[PDB]
Design a protein around this ligand. Structure first.
Ligand SMILES: CN(C)Cc1ccc(C#N)cc1
Ligand SMILES: [Zn+2]
Length: 140
């Protein structure tokens, strides 16, 4: 579990969005596994605006942050998980690391701020849904 709290936005994995998220919906994309809802209180996170390929992510199933190198966001085939079938996911970055279903929502961060959230796992990789292209998160 986990979210990004930027401005008056909450960014969550679409597959973990709540009824309140859907009732306060800003934007969602199944192909990216992302959903954004509106919040009453402003949040503490800053979104990275960069093309870094190195950062640190939080792994809840290890209670640990790990430094990783990761691929640039792309359209990638993802094998079946507990929460999605085997399918293509867009805007997905991969690193070598540990990721189980409940790790979804852990933050990946670089020197510029939040890069994305854990979205995929298995076979010794962790996949992250990028948010650096969502420039509208920084205003309004
Ligand atoms: C449970 N396994 C059969 C894979 C899977 C997991 C979740 C969903 C959804 N929705 C679809 C398929
Ligand atoms: Zn960066």
């Amino acid at each position: 579990s986990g979210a990004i709290y930027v401005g008056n936005y909450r960014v969550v994995n679409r597959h973990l969005a709540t009824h309140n998220d859907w009732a306060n919906l800003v934007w969602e994309d199944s192909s990216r596994d992302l959903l954004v809802s509106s919040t009453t209180a402003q949040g503490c996170d800053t979104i990275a605006r960069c093309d870094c390929q190195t950062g640190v992510y939080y792994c809840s199933s290890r209670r640990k942050h790990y430094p990783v190198s990761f691929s640039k966001p792309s359209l990638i085939f993802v094998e079946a998980s507990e929460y999605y079938p085997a399918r293509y996911q867009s805007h997905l970055m991969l690193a070598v690391g540990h990721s189980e279903p409940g790790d979804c929502g852990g933050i990946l961060r670089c020197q510029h701020g939040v890069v994305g959230i854990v979205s995929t796992g298995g076979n010794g990789l962790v996949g992250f849904a990028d948010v650096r292209d969502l420039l509208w998160l920084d205003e309004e």
